[PDB]
Structure formats: structure tokens, C-alpha cells
């Protein structure tokens, strides 16, 4: 269970960027007619990522394998598959096949597509930043409003997602394991560990945002990501804002890139707007912590 | 000794209480209710803890004994008697023990006396002074989520914390269909005291609960609006004598019961610490709850019904010192006179009323002499 | 909520200073700031917590051209207040005038002590009443305050002088009576013929009769401060304290009673023919009490509270005739688990004798005496600057000669309005 | 994707020996190279491996001139920092100058130990500001990594020109400094002088030296706040998972750090969280406001306990706040590393943009201000004399830390969204 937190719930980061530098390059260099998506070469980045995990290929860390279902033959810009087809499944012995479980698996995957696309938007952070370091802003001696703009744009964006990445790394990763670490030992009954786990899992599902429940929350973090997806993907494909003045040079769509993320900051405005109401209706303790973190200091900042 | 009542389709006089409750119609008339109810009660001793187990091995030695009487050609009444005494005593030696020593019945009551009886002065003066205004107003749907968060925010701002104590802690308002008048404090329990706070006694330290709080919000807004004066005309003597004309009947409901809980409590106690019988501790506490429900004035039923009418004439000079330090002789001065007559009248009612010459009545009945105006205005 | 705790001036400080060191015997702070091990009450109300354990009362040291007082920052309890504050003549105008130039960043500093502070209500001043630069300056600060903390009250600890007419003594007690009854809140004031009189009743400490009474005065501080450290059922805040002590602007100056002198059970009904006594007022014509508020508080038991207080109504053998309708007012308060108070009944009257008014009347036969004499006058060179022609000092006579009418006045039915 | 650093000049020598010899700890290494068992790591991240486990890091030595540089020839400690790789002045210039002479001797140094990882990601200087040799030194490396490298994201530890008032010509050498950094670096880790000496009242009575003293700080900072890139988990495994929150962008890239609780090499969180704001410590000494901060969290921490703390420093309000946008705590929140010592069980330090930096560096072109308009104390060896003559390497260097103390002040406000 702790390998398979360390896999699967990424808490070897080391592989699990090791997958997302493989993965997400070869995703970042487009091929948007679904043309990654070939059994070879997707073995063989998983079967990188795999050596490249650093904590070796153990009998803990055996059985790994990747899953998709309706493949798909398009990708939508900045090549994000937000239809989350790409996914890593244990392969489970008989003795482990008692408390080890489908509709376990099923979720367990789940949640790993939904932090795997949350590791795209890590990819995407880096992708929007080496953009900065792609022309260096070679004219060393002139400086941009454009630069110190959209580059303190994507500052707000990247401390968006990465709190988010550490609210959901709370959510799950000690916030519903710590508890489970204790429950585990506990108790004395095959059925009882099945169900344990049981608990351990559904608990991950409703505080991690995934559950259906917290869904129309969940539709605002697409809203979000899909805006960034396809707003960034049209700076990573151009360059630096108009001539003249503290200037940088050669994209006329700057507009377009600050009303864009006039867009995103709506949508967290929205969002702020929207969390309140489950907190205050419901009781789930998360979404507070949530609120409680993501616009820390006032109504909104 | 097992719990069962194995008695099918019929009555054995014994008709969670319901199937566990004696019937005396078809009760013999040699057998007196006053073994009855002992018997009843070490029924439902075993009930509860006949389940969670999946409280002693003597059964044998009862079975024993009770075929010992079964076997006298003669009735032995007082024989009979005693050993289910005895019996009804060998359990309560130990539910008596399972309340205190794996219970901390001192220790919930100690949490009741904190919270239904305002025992914690500092945190509920800073759970009133962060949460009085939407409280003030009519409550709608989530004020009482933002004064839970409140009372919790009240309970950790005074630095003191405790043992973490808020988990079992919610503020329930009667929403909808004054947020102060339909407040109240609800309160959980675990299954080894369970049976012993029925809600049947805690809707009661509600009502003192509200009682209390009720009182005590006012007699602080008062003296909060003494202070919009104070930084600084003739008529700042008028507003400042009548407020000590509404400091004193407010002080009065309430100075009193300072004393007369801790004094009440301070008897119950003992009566805890007293001896190792559960039902010395049930009827403990039954006479402690019954004693201060006379003492909530509710008996003493004519200012019981003027107790939140001269709250709200307090509430009316309260309210309408709010706004000027200045000169207010253009209705503020005189319909304050009002309120410096009625309140010195009404507590002549109450005077005569003070003459069940209970302690406490006749403490109150201390505080208005030489000073004679309030019991001759 | 929550007091500032400010000090300044000679007596000011010291009574401050001479506090912090009786709590340290009666309450739970060592002279570090550091919470002791004698530590059931709450210390937030009056001091800071600053997070490794020292409890800092939120107070200050400004002493401008001292004679003694210079010694006070290396005495133990000084200490106590950590933060740093020790800033910036003795007379009263040399306190107010210069506070034009003085008070924009001692301001600083009292907001520093408001950072102090999670949510305001007040500030504690103790303040020199006649003895030093804070009459003047902390009668300044009352201003300075009130310009941009109008809702929040000053508290006035203070001494007052009577002591058979240095010598200069009254000159700088007048000015604080006429600001003070202009703008302030309450002053807890505390005399020099009664509490002299007084200690000699328990101990030999006449030789320095003025610095001897802080010790007494101290008490008195810590005993209107009790139920404000201790979680008392009632008046666990000034307002509530003060309430019907101060029912009118004007005779806002306070008088306090112990008569548990033998301060080191008895039953409590044991005090209640002593506690009548006018012999124990320690600010000691002819008087009443305005209305009856007092104190039980440490050993305090049940039945003998309950009647204890009925045995004091049963002698009543105190003039309690005016028109403030209280006969008495008491409850009941927890206590330190630990250090004692006084006889550890604790019991204190604080229902409000007019006798506080002829002390006021002997600090005018004191001003009157000087004022006549004009001897000892010595024009400090910063003590011309607040009168254009010693014209507020007779505004101050003017008035506290209406405040000593008016306590009298409410000696009788006919202070239902000015005149 | 690894590191490379460099330690230069005599207190980076000094402080990248110390920073070293307390990764002597924090990974079990021989003076001389080879592996100790002590100290869930996988060293791939900041170590080569020579296959007998000798640990050799990604790093660059200098000897030089036998000024205190030649401090490592004084250690037992010659092959623990050093792939065998060590390459053979009181004022800027000579410094600068002595870069320019050696810059393509050690780029080979720095490209052939480059070669020695699988991919980099950034450098890191033990870099003087202020410094004789090693600013001047590093300040030009710096310009050179600009031109030959800028595509790794180098960072910089930056011990800064306050040693509570060593080279008289220290302003000068600063503003050269600054006027490089404004225009080449990703990121700046200040450190305040001042306030690592201050750092040190809440655990000792040593505060003087403001050098051998302040190295054990610089190391435990250092070492704490590159501890989860060796000692990895789920997430902020490269330097740019932080650097990305410590520095919004280049045009405000000087860090406010803070080694906040003495401890933070347990108490509950709710009582470390207010030791991590104390006022009196932080390595930083009219409006002064937080924009992002972060708390690098490797801590025995249970998350029940954070959400009640984060709530309790919500009512302190000791954070100040409402900037342009991102003002929010980054608590990333990880178990404690394992070699970080078990004596007090949380720590991650709490690091941040703040405009009280912005006063440091109103401060260092005040300290500037001190020399030029009185010229005091000039040297006029031509070494110092032949470059720094039309001040515009001070002027325009002023000019652009001033427009960023405008921008710093502007993003401490929300009105910083607008064009104006």
C-alpha cells in the first residue's frame, strides 16, 4: 500500500516526474491528431519513467502497467486529453486479489488521472515559465511592461494551481492516509481490512474533490484549467507584445492575453462566490480548509 | 441476571423502558412497589451491558440462592426482598463506578456547569461582544454556522484553551416561522452516560441556559452603553441615574444566581462524592435539576412573567442611549421616566412577592432597603 | 475584551511599578514576564502574549527630568513589561505643554501596545495624580486618546495629598481634577490623611507616609482588578465594574474599603459588622453612601456568602439614606489557585461614600494655603507654558469646589439636576 | 535534472565550505568522498557517483589568490566538495577583472562537470554581495552564465552588505553588483546580515562576528531549504517547484527569508506556525506588506492539526496582507527529511516576497548615498579607477531597483492590475 501510494498517489515524486517529463514533453511537442497515442511508444515512456523512478524496479515496485479506454485519435489544444484516457493499473495477485478489489482499482485510477492532468498543469507551469527562459529576454538591456505584466500574470495563475496541488496533496495524501495508517492496524478481520480500505478510498474520493457531490466545484477547476490550457498554449506559439517604449517585441495579440486572464481572475472571483455554498449548506470540512486557504486573507485579493 | 424477559404472551408484571417498564395493575398485592421499582431498576442495569459484549460471574451463586428460596413451603417476603436487594445493590456498586471511574461524571458536569451555566464568564463575554449584532437582529439560515464559528473563534480567543472541548459543542437557533430569544445549546454524549443525561434533562439546562444568557447579554449591553456617555449637560444626570435604575433590577435577577448556582452545585457535588450507588447519583441529580428550577424563578410565576418584559424595557433604554452624548430632553429625558418609575414599581410588586421564602428569595429581598425607593415607588 | 495598561510619571510609574510587585504575591507573573509556577486566572485582559510564555502587561515608561524614578527601570518589576519602551519636566504644565511636541511618537508607542491588544475597550492609566509628569502628560494622553479613541475609556489610578499642608505637593494635583472632570472616564483616587491613618491600624510604615501608601494603593489596584483577572460571574470588565460606581459625569473620582487590614476559617459572616465600620474608607461635614457595590472573592463558601450577606443587612449600622437605590450588591468570583488576599475572605466595600469629597475640600485648603503663601513656586523653565496667568488652576478650584457641593448635593434628595 | 554550484571569492568559499561540511551531515560523506550509511534519499539530484560510492557533488572550487579563497587548503575536507577540480583583490573591479581573465577556465570546469548528470536545472553561488573578490567574481561568472548558459534557472545565495556598521568600498561593490543582478538573475536569495546576526537571540548570545558566525546559519538555511530536492516526495522536487513562489518574476527576484523558529533545522502546528512569524527573528531586517509566501513544510505534521492552525494565524493576523493577487501562504506540507535532526520534529522555514525588502533596498542605495556624495575612502588604484568613472554602473543600477522598489510597493497593493 505504501508502494502503491508511492506510484500510483505519486508520492515518489521522483518517478511520478519522471512519467510527467517523458509524458508531458512528448505531449508539449503536440502530435494533436491523437498521434502519441501508439502502444510503443507509450510503453516505452512508462517503461522509462519506470527506470528512471530511482527507487528501482523492487518486487513492491513490480506490476505496473498503463490503461486507457476509447483511445483517443484527437487532442484538444495545448494538448491537455481533459477526457483524462491516460492511466497506470497494479497488477494483483490472487492472496493480494481479496483486499485488493475493482471498484478499488477503478477509483484508484480515477484519482490518478484526476492528479495526473493536475501534474499536466504542473507541466503547464513549466512550460509558461521556460517561456521566460526560451529568448531569455536576450536584449539583456531593455525592459518590458509586457514582461513585468504577463510574467506576474502566470505568478498568480502557477500560486492558483500549485495551492490547489497542496490543498489536494492534503486532501488525500495525509489528510484521508494518516487516519488510515492507525485504522489499518486496528483491526483483526479480513472483511474489516476490506472495508477499511473501503473507507480509506471513499473518504479519498469526497475530500479530493472528485466526488460527485462536490462537482459543480470541480466544473470551475475545468473552467479554470481549460482557460489556461488554451490562452498559454498562444504565448508558448508566439513571442514578446508590441514595439515601443519599455517594450518587448514580436506578438501584435497582447489584448487578447490580458483579457484572458481578466477571464481567469473572473472565474476566481466566481469561484469564491460559488464554495461558500456548500460549506454553508452542507457540512464538509475540506471546503472550508479550502476557502479557508485559497483567497487566505480577504473576501478576495 | 440474562436480561431476558422471557415472558410470552403474557404479563410477569414487567409490561429501551418500553417492554422495561413495570406494570403494577398485575402486580401482586404481598409485593410492594417499593422492591418493584428495585427490581425494575436491575433489569435495566443488565440491559445495558447485556449488548457490548459482543456485570460479574456470581450468577451461579444468585441462581443458587434464589432456588434456595424457591424451595421454602412458606412465602419469605423479607427474605425475597433481601437477596433482590442485595442483587439491586451488587449492580449499582458498579454503575456507580462505570459514571465516575470510567465515566468522568465530574468531568461532563464540569463541561454542563462551563457551558449551560455560563461557568466560563470570559468566553461567553466574548462570544456575546463578537457575536451580539446578527444575533440582535432576527436570525436567518447560516447565522447559526457563523455563530458556531464564532463560539468557536470565542472559545480559542481567549487563550485559555482547554481540553479541546468544542467537538461536542454546537449553538442551535429555532430558525424561521431574535436570534438571542430562539438560540439555545445543544449537546452529545457517549453510550456509558448516555441513560443518565436524557434529553428529558438537558431541555431544562436549556431553558436555564437561556434564562441566564438572556439576563446576562442585557446586563452587559448596558453597561457598554454607559460608556457612550462617559466620553465626556443637565441631562447626562437623567440618562446616568436611570442607568443605575436599570443596573439594579438586572444586577438583581442575577448577582443572586452567581451564588445560588454554585451554592446548588456545591450540594450536588457532595451528593456525587457521597456514596457508591447509582441511584443515589440519578436522585442527586433529580433533586439538584428540581431544586434550580425554583430557582429559575418560573414558580415565582408573576416575575417569571415580567422577567423578558423588563429585559425589553431595559432593551428600550438600551437602545435609545445609542447615539448622542448630548442634551436628548426632546423625548429620550422624558421617555426615560417611564422606565426610572416602572422599574422601581414593578420591583415593589416583587418586593412583596420576596416577603417560597426560599434563601435565595430572601436574599433578593436584602438588596432594596435603606434605599427604600424600590419597594416604595 | 481587552485594556492597555499605560504608566508615566513619578508615582505613576511606581504605583505601577509597586502593582506588578504585589501581584507578584497575589497573582500568577514572575519580574521576568515569564508565567510562575503559583500561576484559574486569565492574564490577556491587561498583558500581551508574547509567544515563548512572557505575559507583558501593555505598558510603558516615560519619565521626563525625574528625582528617584530613574531607579524604577532597574528595580526587578519593571522588567515585566518587555518590550522596550523606556522613552521621554516634573511639573504639571511641563508635562502638558511639551506634550505638543511629545505626544507624535509616544502615540507610537501606545498603538505599538495596542498591537498588543486583540480588540481594544480601554486603557488603564496609571498616571501620576499630583506626583510628577504625568500630571500633565498622562492627563495629555487623555486628550491625545480621546482625538482618535473617543469609545474607549481611561482608567485613572492616582494618590492624593493631605498630609498636614515636598511642600509643593497640591500645586500639581488641581489640573488633573479639571481635565479629568472635562473629558475622563474614572479615577480610583486614594488619600494621604486616610490611608496614612489606615496603615498605621496593621503596620510601622509612617516614616515615608506618601511612598508608603503605594503599598496600599497597590492593593487597592489589584483588589479592582480582581474580578477582571479572575473569571467572576459579574464584572469580568471595566464597564461592568464601574457601571453604578460613576451614575453621572461629574463625581466620576471613585473611593474603595478594606477592613480585612489584618490582610495574612472564620466564617464569612465573621467581617459583617466590621465591613460597616466608616473608620475603614480609605478616603475617609457630613457623608452617605450614593449606592451600596462590594466584594467576596477566595474562601468563598456557600452558605456562609449567603449570609454573611444577610447578617450585613441585618445590622446596617451605615449611613446608606440617599436616592441611588442599591442597599447592596455582591455575587460571588473565583480566585488564584494559590496566593492569598486579604484575610482570604478578601471581602472590600466599594459602594460610594460623598466622604471623598471633603478630602477634595482638604486638597483645597492645601491649594488655598499655597495659593496665599505662593512660596514654594520655583517657575520651572517649561512649567509657565500651559497658563496664560495661573488662570486654570483657578478654573480646577472653581470646579472641584462644584465637586465637593455635588457630593454633598447627592448627600441630599436635590441632585436631580444641576444648580 | 541536477544541480551545479559554486562557491568563489573568500566568504563564498567560506560559506560554500561550511554549506558543504553541513551536507557532510545531511548526506553521509567522507572528507574524501566515499559513502557513510547515515543520511528516503536518493543523492542522483545534487551527486555524481564515482562507482565505488564515492558522492562527488556538482560542484565548482576555487583556490586563487592566497587571500582567505586559499581557506580550503586549511581543511581535512579536500575531496568532499571537490572533484578534483580546483581552479589555481579588496574592491569590484578587481574582482570583475579577475573573472574576465580566468571566465573560459572555468567554463571548462563548469561545462565538464555539467556533463556529469543526466540533465541540469540550475546553478547556485555562495555569492558576497558587496564582497572583494567574490562579488566582482561571482557578479561576472554570472554575466558569462547569462551568455554561455541561461538555460538552466540559475539561483544564489546572496549574504547581504548590512554587517551592522569588512571593506569600506562594500557600497560600490553592492550597486556594481545590482546593477548585473537586476539584468541577468531568476532568482536572489538575500540574506540580511543584520538580521542573521538578530536570528540568533532566540536560541544564543553569540551575535557579533556577523561572518564565522553567520556560516553555520547560512549552511543550516541552505541545507533546510534544499533538503527536499535530495530527500525527495510528491511534490516540489525541482528548484523551480519553489522558485517559481519565492520569485514571482525577475523584476522583483530579491527573496525575504526567514529561519523564523530557531528550530526549524515538535509542538503542535498552531504553536510552531507563531514561532515562524516572530518579528524579532527572520533573516530581514512606509506601508511594508507580504505578496506570496512560503512555508517549505518537511515536518511530522498531521493534517488535522494545520487547518486549526492555519485558522488561528487567520486571527493573529500577523501575515500582512492584500497585495495585487497572490498574497496566500504556500504551506507545501511534507514529512521531516530524513536526516533532519529529530530534536523539535517540524520544520520548512517561511520564505517570501515583502515589501520590507524593498526598504533593504532602499537602504543599500542609501548606504551608496553615504559614499557618493562625499566620495569617501575612493582606493584610485587604476584597477579600481578605470571603470567606475562615469557612475552610470551605480546611477542606472539605482534606477532599476528603484523602479523595482515601485514595483514591489504597487504589487503590495490591488490597484497593481491596471495600466497606469
Redesign the interface.
Known sequence: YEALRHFLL?????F??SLSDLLFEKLGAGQTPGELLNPLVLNSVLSKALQCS??GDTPHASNLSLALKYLPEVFAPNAPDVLSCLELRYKVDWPLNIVITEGCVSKYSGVFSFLLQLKLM?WA??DV?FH??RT???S??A?SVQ??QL??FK??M???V??I??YI??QI???TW?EFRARLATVGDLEEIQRAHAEYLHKAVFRGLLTEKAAPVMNVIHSIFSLVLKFRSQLISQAWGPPGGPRGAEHPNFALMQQSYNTF?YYSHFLFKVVTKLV?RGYQ?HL??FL???????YY? | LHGLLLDQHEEFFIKSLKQFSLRVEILPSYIPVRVAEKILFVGESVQMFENQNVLKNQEDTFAAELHRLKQQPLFSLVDFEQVVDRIRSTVAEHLWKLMVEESDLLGQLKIIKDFYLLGRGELFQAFIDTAQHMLKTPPTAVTEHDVNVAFQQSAHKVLLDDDNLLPLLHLTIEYHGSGWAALGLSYKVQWPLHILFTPAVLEKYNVVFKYLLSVRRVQAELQHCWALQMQRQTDAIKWRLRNHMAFLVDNLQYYLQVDVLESQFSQLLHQINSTRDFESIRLAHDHFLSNLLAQSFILLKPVFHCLNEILDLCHSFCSLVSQNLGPLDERGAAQLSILVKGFSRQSSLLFKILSHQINSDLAQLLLRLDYNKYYTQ | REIITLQLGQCGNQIGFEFWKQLCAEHGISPEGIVEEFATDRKDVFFYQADDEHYIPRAVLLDLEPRVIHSILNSPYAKLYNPENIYLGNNWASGFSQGEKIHEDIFDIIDREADGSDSLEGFVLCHSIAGGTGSGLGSYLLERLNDRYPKKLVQTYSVFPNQDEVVVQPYNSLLTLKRLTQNADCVVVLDNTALNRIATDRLHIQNPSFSQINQLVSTIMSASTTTLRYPGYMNNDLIGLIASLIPTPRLHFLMTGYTPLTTDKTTVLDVMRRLLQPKNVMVSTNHCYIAILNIIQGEVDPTQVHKSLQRIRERKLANFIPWGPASIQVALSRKSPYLPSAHRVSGLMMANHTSISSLFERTCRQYDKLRKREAFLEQFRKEDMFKDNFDEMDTSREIVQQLIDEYHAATRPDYISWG
Open positions: 505519486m508520492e515518489d515524486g521522483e511520478a516526474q530511482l527507487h504542473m507551469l513549466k515559465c521566460l527562459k531569455a529576454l536576450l539583456h538591456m525592459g514582461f513585468r510574467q506576474l505568478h498568480e502557477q500560486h492558483f500549485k495551492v496541488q497542496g496533496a492534503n495524501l495525509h489528510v494518516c481572475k454553508n470540512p472550508e480548509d479557508l486557504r485559497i483567497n487566505f486573507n480577504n485579493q
